[PDB]
């Protein structure tokens, strides 16, 4: 029952760093610092990182390394009653792959668009522009880069809404095909190749965040942007909303309990010091976010100073930052083509190995649970990525951004929080932090000190509950740029969200009906770990 291993410790480290370092480190954390009191936000952020964030990240890595099985079997062995957690996490990863790869497809589409002597989003004189186009962001106007992204890359304004996807843009579909070809030929042979491809995809982002940071800080007006980024306003941290933003950003940034770190740690040598790896990789996780915040805001300072654009207009999160505002800045600086190329390659590589993460979570879980497709990994992964492509054609339609945004909100946000809440409960209360401390001691040679036991037992479930309650308090029906989604689309969203979490109680009940005996005997038989 012995299994392959990483064939290199640095392959494990770089793979976990790759997965843990998403575009969200670039297009969310800097915006959160700007919005929520600048450098004062590093108090809520640092506290919520130390409490709950890293404890859950270390817990997941330790579970993965100890049980030597991917999510579905790991949870089925750890606490048979909660086996449904593995299927929930696999469904969530599966639903993420439909939408997340589209961001990489857009990054490649802009990368190929950058091979020109004059970047096409420079100006309003192109056939796709409207008379409401203006060179840069302004109130009551559309920026030239926004006109390019919406009306030429997405062609979104040719779609009435999510009921009207329109024609497939084959120039986008080809890019999404290239994305799935890269994912296939990296994942098909497993970690023997994935660990080597991450040596590119996990390290090129730091070549970019180096030379693009040097470009940033040398621009005129950079320091004004650093001031907007880090001017501390401790009056803000008195407001709970800042603590909810910090907690949710920590959770989704690290992605603890997502089943991907179970998959990656499962291939470690059993006596590998997983504690040192969890601390190293979460520290670089937040470090990279902070440095990417200087990368973003040095350029947003250059814009706010030199181009006259109002800072409130450019400082934004998500695709609007990286496909509108930041390339609109790149278009103006010397060697615009070079910075466009390396920037969009940075976004591509930030997305690629974060997508390898979810794909390897799926393929490990299903390999370990179903050997019929452990022996045929190549054919299975070809069928998986062919499914993701045939579905992703919907997200390459003219209306495709509406489908992307629907999944981006509903596909994973709420469901993974309740999945990881039941992970922390099953580990710390049903399995027991005593047993889990013996397991960690046997792996790495020392028990996790009382701090970690207190975090995993009490504070991690409160942390996750605080995150999910503030995501539900903050709920408002899905809307985008004065398109308000029909109620049937929000219903489909909640159905997609429920489809994963319903596995937890559905599988728990199915298990509780199949095991014999009286109810308490069934509970005991379903609580005894597989190794006991």
């Amino acid at each position, epitope marked *: 029952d012995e299994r392959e291993t990483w064939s290199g410790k640095v392959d494990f480290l770089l793979s976990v760093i790759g997965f843990a370092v998403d575009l969200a480190n670039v297009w969310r954390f800097p915006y959160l610092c700007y919005k929520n009191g600048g450098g004062a936000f590093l108090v809520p952020y640092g506290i919520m990182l130390a409490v709950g964030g890293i404890p859950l990240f270390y817990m997941e890595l330790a579970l993965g390394q100890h049980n030597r099985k991917g999510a579905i079997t790991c949870w089925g062995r750890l606490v048979p009653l909660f086996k449904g957690i593995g299927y929930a996490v696999v469904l969530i990863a599966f639903y993420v792959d439909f939408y997340y790869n589209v961001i990489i497809a857009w990054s490649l589409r802009f990368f190929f668009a950058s091979f020109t002597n004059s970047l096409p989003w420079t100006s309003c004189n192109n056939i796709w522009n409207t008379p409401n186009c203006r060179p840069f962001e302004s109130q009551g106007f559309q920026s030239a880069a926004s006109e390019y992204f919406n009306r030429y890359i997405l062609e979104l304004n040719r779609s009435e809404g999510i009921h009207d996807l329109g024609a497939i843009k084959w120039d986008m579909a080809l890019c999404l095909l290239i994305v799935y070809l890269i994912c296939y030929f990296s994942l098909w042979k497993g970690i023997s190749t994935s660990g080597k491809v991450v040596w590119f995809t996990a390290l090129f982002p730091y070549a970019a965040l180096l030379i693009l940071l040097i470009r940033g800080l040398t621009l005129p007006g950079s320091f004004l942007g650093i001031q907007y980024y880090l001017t501390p306003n401790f009056s803000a941290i008195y407001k709970a909303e800042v603590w909810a933003d910090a907690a949710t950003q920590v959770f989704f940034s690290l992605g603890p309990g997502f089943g991907v770190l179970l998959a990656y740690a499962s291939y470690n040598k059993y006596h590998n010091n997983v504690y040192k790896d969890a601390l190293l990789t979460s520290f670089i996780n937040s470090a990279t976010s902070f440095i990417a915040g200087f990368v973003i805001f040095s350029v947003l300072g250059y814009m706010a100073h030199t181009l006259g654009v109002r800072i409130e207009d450019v400082a934004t999160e998500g695709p609007g930052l990286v496909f509108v505002v930041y390339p609109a800045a790149i278009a103006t600086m010397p060697a615009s083509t070079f910075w466009a190329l390396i920037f969009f390659m940075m976004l591509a590589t930030l997305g690629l190995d974060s997508s390898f993460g979810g794909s390897e979570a799926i393929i490990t879980a299903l390999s370990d649970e179903f050997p019929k497709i452990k022996r045929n990994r190549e054919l299975f992964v070809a069928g998986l990525f062919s499914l993701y492509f045939v579905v992703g054609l919907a997200s390459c339609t003219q209306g495709g951004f509406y489908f992307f945004h629907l999944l981006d909100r509903y596909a994973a946000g709420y469901s993974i929080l309740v999945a990881v809440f039941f992970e922390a409960i099953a580990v710390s209360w049903i399995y027991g932090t*005593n*047993r889990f*401390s*013996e397991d960690i*001691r*046997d792996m790495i*040679g*020392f*028990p996790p000190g009382r701090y970690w036991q207190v975090c995993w037992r009490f504070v991690a479930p409160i942390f996750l509950l605080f995150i999910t309650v503030y995501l539900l308090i903050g709920y408002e029906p899905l809307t985008y740029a004065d398109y308000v989604y029909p109620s049937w689309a929000n219903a489909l969203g909640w159905c997609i969200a429920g489809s994963s979490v319903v596995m937890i109680p559905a599988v728990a009940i199915f298990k509780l009906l199949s095991t014999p005996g009286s109810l308490r005997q069934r509970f005991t038989i379903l609580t005894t770990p597989w*190794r*006991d």
Partner: antibody, heavy 118, light 108 residues
Framework: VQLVESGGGLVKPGGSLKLSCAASGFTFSSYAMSWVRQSPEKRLEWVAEISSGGRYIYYSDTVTGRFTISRDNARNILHLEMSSLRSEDTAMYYC????????????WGQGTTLTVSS | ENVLTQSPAIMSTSPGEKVTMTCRASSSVGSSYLHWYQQKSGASPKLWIYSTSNLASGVPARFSGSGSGTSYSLTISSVEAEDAATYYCQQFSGYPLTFGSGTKLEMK
């Protein structure tokens, strides 16, 4: 903290015995105790180890299958059952506290002598 | 197995001499997992050094440990008649745990 062992004396070759170690002054439940024996030539030799909760057990190849380490987290007693004792088992057996591999056997019992002969 | 052999098997010193004793591992032992124990005649061993270097609680600073890999050493900067004990190295990195053959300081 102190550990004190009990049981020992004379056993016939091929006979059986149970050693015990009583733990006091620390929360016994959370420390992985070990047994270490000293031959009369004063060579130390690790015999067996038991984790905090008793779920991970290890033995040296010279003892495996003959002895059975055991633990009582309610009474704070550590045990070593012995079967098919041999002349080579004549030794002083030390209870050793041994929780953290990067600390070693930081506390030792008094030891009890065991001799195997007719 | 990972037998450890200590050298010398026996040693003798005047007080105030400086001496070194070595633990040789038949396989490489992580620097974090080699320990040294002191046993005085007629009493249980005590932990003395709990890595290459770290002195245990109550161990006098005259002792120091050094080296790594397959050759570990315990050093005494000034030997004192009040030790004159038997010292055993031990590896904790892999099972079975192996103590060294031990070495002894006899005061001249």
């Amino acid at each position: 903290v102190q550990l004190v062992e009990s049981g020992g004396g004379l056993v016939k070759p091929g006979g059986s015995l149970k050693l015990s170690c009583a733990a006091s002054g620390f929360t016994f439940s959370s420390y992985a105790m070990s047994w270490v024996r000293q031959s009369p030539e004063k060579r130390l030799e690790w015999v067996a180890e038991i984790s905090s909760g008793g779920r991970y057990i290890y033995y040296s190849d010279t003892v495996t299958g003959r002895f059975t380490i055991s633990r009582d987290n309610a009474r704070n007693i550590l045990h070593l059952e012995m079967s098919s004792l041999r002349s080579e088992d004549t030794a002083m057996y030390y209870c050793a506290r041994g929780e953290v591999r990067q600390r070693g056997f930081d506390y030792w019992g008094q030891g009890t002598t065991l001799t195997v002969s007719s | 197995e990972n037998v450890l052999t200590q050298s010398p098997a026996i040693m003798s010193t005047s007080p105030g001499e400086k001496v070194t004793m070595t633990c040789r591992a038949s396989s490489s032992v992580g620097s974090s997992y080699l320990h040294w124990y002191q046993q005085k005649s007629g009493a249980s061993p005590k932990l003395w050094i709990y890595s290459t270097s770290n002195l245990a609680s109550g161990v006098p600073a005259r002792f120091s440990g050094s080296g790594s890999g397959t050759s570990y050493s315990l050093t005494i900067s000034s030997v004192e008649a009040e030790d004159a004990a038997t010292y055993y190295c031990q590896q904790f990195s892999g099972y079975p745990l192996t103590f060294g053959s031990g070495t002894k300081l006899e005061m001249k």
